[PDB]
Amino acid sequence: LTIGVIGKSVHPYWSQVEQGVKAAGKALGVDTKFFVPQKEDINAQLQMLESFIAEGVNGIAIAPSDPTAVIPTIKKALEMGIPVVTLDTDSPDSGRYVYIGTDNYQAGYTAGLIMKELLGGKGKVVIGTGSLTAMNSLQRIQGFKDAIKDSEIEIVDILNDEEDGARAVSLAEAALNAHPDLDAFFGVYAYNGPAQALVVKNAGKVGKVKIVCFDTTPDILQYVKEGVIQATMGQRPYMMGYLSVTVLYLMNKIGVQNTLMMLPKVKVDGKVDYVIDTGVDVVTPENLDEYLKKMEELGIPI
């Protein structure tokens, strides 16, 4: 059997997902194809998707940079008898059987409450994300807004870098100059937190300008350690990759229905959906050490 997985960018975050993909494949005796474009690239994801289908893979897990754009192709994959699940970010109307990843809206809400606390309920915030089409970005941002709604905290900007590191840095660097009265940064994607951290450090504003972001890749954790980042919403990319392969494997061996019978279910608009929530680890400078301990203890060290 062969299973194909499609990510959204070349960030180390997707490396963790790939490791999960390969480990699951090795444990189950399955071949895995992994693809991630350099930066956000909807057309490349579509072509790779078209390609995996033509190759006749037995399963596809995809993290859509655009949930609507992939619907027709995902429908074809399903017509061709190839199971499809989403991971990292969802496309609920595509026909994908299961979404596997973080509860994005809530992850953002939590980050919003943390921010609300750090700023004492007031101040100006600039948001940095790598997409304005991916549903996971929109949900994290939406949840952030909903969490600070009952305060005087105002978001003065939402900057999209298309999942490009240099671009994320220069956009945050300019936003800092356009807003010398900025109180905080909110990084929605893995590139954003450490980009805003470099900006703030470069301007000598560590502590002055708060940073609440996502993920726990090396560069981020190092800034959390230096105290530049007060809090980051850590995900479980590895698990997302490992369970995606597993779920698709089962759907081939035991069938789509039997596989769904054993997964967590939720209700959307009075209808049943399937969601495996991989959880978030709220990491701050105070609990960093426990985090490095907890991770290695769970089997995914450093």
Add this chain to the structure above:
Amino acid sequence: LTIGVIGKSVHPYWSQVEQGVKAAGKALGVDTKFFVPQKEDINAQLQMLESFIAEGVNGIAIAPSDPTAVIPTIKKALEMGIPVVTLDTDSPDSGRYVYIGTDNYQAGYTAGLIMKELLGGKGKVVIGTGSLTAMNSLQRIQGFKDAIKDSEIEIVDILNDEEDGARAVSLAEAALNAHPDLDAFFGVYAYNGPAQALVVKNAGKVGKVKIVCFDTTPDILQYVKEGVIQATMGQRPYMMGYLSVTVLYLMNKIGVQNTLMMLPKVKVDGKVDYVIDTGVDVVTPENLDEYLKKMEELGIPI
């Protein structure tokens, strides 16, 4: 790989469980050992459990007729690296990783609410079960009690047949001739429903005496067709046996933890537990054709 499954009795209900166990094994390439004593026999379950452990199976799924009696042995199995899950009825402190089956307490509550409606909150009811140790029987019973608590309905008898057909019958008709003024019969196990129905149809009480039971085996359904049984809480024995083999298979291939995070979790006494609720189908004479249609569509016809 070899998976061992232990049932509670020779009822056709367990044949359904076994078909699932054999279907899963076949689809996954796993050998399956299946055991059920003639009637309730805790000692036989324990003896069979000890042999599967000695024979070094790679997984065990058990439906303990006594949740406490099996703890030391299940613990021994786990100590020796053999994953254990429960199905049909639980043993929450045995150390088993997952419970796969009906939500027994709630299915009982639902059963109680249906009676309460049928009897106008008043009348004499006699419960018929096949165990007073098995947790699924105690939960279904405690649930029936909790549902009709604030009504005038009363339970005059709780007859235990130790999962024996003839005993289910002779115990019933020895309650209808000690209570010819009996309002209703409540069958907890699959043996009970048909027995109670055979009795009631004999004493020409078809309709007079109310019958609310569990399961949808040939006989139970037949009597729902003749309006002898008004409502029966149907389970999914097939799914229980199929998923039990699947879960144990995964635990061997990808590990216990990776498998657990794929399943629905619940919080019990502040600690996370894993439970696959195979759901219940409330069947009445009104929808006895829709139920047949539904089962036919899910791949488990007739």
